[PDB]
Design a protein around this ligand. Structure first.
Ligand SMILES: Cc1cc2nc3c(=O)[nH]c(=O)nc-3n(C[C@H](O)[C@H](O)[C@H](O)COP(=O)(O)O)c2cc1C
Ligand SMILES: Cc1ccc(-c2ccc(-c3nc4ccc(F)cc4c(C(=O)O)c3C)cc2)c(Cl)n1
Ligand SMILES: O=C(O)c1cc(=O)[nH]c(=O)[nH]1
Length: 350
């Protein structure tokens, strides 16, 4: 009911008042304080868990696990925190976040600023009973694991994240030659298998859209060989699509938001084909409407995430994507999200 107020007045006012990193910090703190029903059609069972709805908040908004409960209150069907590095680290120098308002886009080069595993673990331990309730009610928690800039043993950094935060997570994410990738992911999976849980977390690989065809075939091959549980497609892009209008489009960093929509959907289609539909995909990049979510589901995604759209449309975007997706599924005769997954590949086969 508040869509137009946030879209035309509140969010533009906040963006005019604050630089984007300051607004980001305010948004996390405000969400952490809290303040204010999903159709059965939107339920997805995947990654060994129930998802009450398929619209998650992507990594990088709540990097340090400070606002999880508020994000569920906002309506997200799942929350991914991180990236979290083993030791605290500052990230890149400021300024490091740039708004492209004409393009409904952001460029960032945060550089994995992180409070570190211990601080984040302590925050999640404080709410671990609450999360157990939320997970069993269909609201899972994901943790994106990073590595420290100065680490010479990347696999050791990811393994430490599994040891510290694996007991608290429903899924874990590692952002990504082929033999090196195999060795690293083998270590992560062995550490995951070593946890003493009834519900050990799924392990996912998150990829950028900036990969060669050989890179994508190599990743698909290793993911299937090792039994990785899913893919997150995609991270931000270092590319700059034609026609960007924002004055800051030349800043170095990853571009997110509406300009990433096509590249991410194309990459979802390709990875779904290269894994023969065997590997669940979380589709990410430029989702700001139910139509965007449906396009990624038809391309092969089982779940979607959004981030940049929250910065332009505000909290109302979560209910908007969910109710629009539901309506589009009903309009087009799908029984639920699950029936639409990969529908675009069935069209092409026909
Ligand atoms: C400011 C900002 C910070 C981000 N930080 C992370 C991060 O720490 N780890 C990660 O895996 N992705 C990070 N991302 C990428 C998002 O998770 C997502 O993949 C990307 O922004 C595409 O989604 P969107 O177009 O809906 O924003 C970040 C994105 C933005 C815009
Ligand atoms: C009730 C209510 C109202 C508004 C917000 C709310 C306020 C600000 C933002 C916000 N997050 C960002 C995160 C990363 C980033 F790179 C930029 C931003 C920006 C931006 O400056 O472009 C904004 C505005 C999001 C939600 C919340 Cl969380 N709750
Ligand atoms: O912290 C960051 O710079 C960052 C990490 C990441 O995975 N993606 C992104 O866009 N930024």
């Amino acid at each position: 009911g508040d869509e137009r107020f946030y879209a035309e007045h509140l969010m533009p006012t906040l963006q005019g008042l604050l630089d984007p990193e300051s607004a980001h910090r305010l948004a996390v703190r405000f969400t952490s304080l809290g303040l204010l029903q999903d159709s059965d059609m939107l339920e997805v069972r995947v990654l060994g868990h129930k998802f009450r709805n398929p619209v998650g908040i992507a990594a990088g908004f709540d990097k340090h696990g400070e606002a999880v409960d508020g994000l569920y209150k906002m309506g997200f069907g799942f929350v991914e925190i991180g990236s979290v590095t083993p030791k605290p680290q500052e990230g890149n120098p400021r300024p490091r976040v740039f708004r492209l308002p004409e393009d409904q886009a952001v460029i960032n080069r945060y550089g994995f600023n992180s409070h570190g595993l211990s601080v984040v673990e302590h925050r999640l331990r404080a709410r671990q009973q609450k999360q157990a309730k939320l997970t069993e009610d269909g609201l899972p928690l994901g943790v994106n694991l990073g590595k420290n800039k100065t680490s010479v043993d990347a696999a050791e950094d990811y393994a430490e994240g599994v040891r510290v935060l694996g007991p608290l997570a429903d899924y874990l994410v590692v952002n990504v030659g082929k033999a090196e990738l195999r060795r690293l992911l083998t270590k992560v999976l062995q550490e995951r298998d070593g946890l003493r849980r009834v519900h050990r977390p799924a392990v996912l690989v998150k990829i950028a859209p900036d990969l060669t065809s050989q890179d994508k075939e190599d990743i698909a091959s290793v993911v299937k060989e090792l039994g990785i549980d899913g893919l997150i497609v995609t991270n931000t892009t270092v590319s700059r699509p034609a026609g960007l209008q924002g004055a800051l489009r030349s800043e170095t960093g990853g571009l997110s938001g509406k300009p990433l929509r096509d590249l991410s959907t194309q990459t979802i289609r390709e990875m779904y084909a290269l894994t023969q539909g065997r590997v669940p995909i979380i589709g990410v990049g430029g989702v700001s409407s139910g139509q965007d979510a449906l396009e990624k589901i038809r391309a092969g995604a089982s779940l979607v995430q959004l981030y940049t759209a929250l910065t332009f449309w505000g909290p109302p975007v979560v209910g908007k994507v969910k109710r629009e997706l539901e309506a589009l599924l009903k309009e087009q005769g799908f029984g639920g999200v699950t029936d639409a997954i990969g529908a675009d590949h069935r069209r092409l086969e026909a």
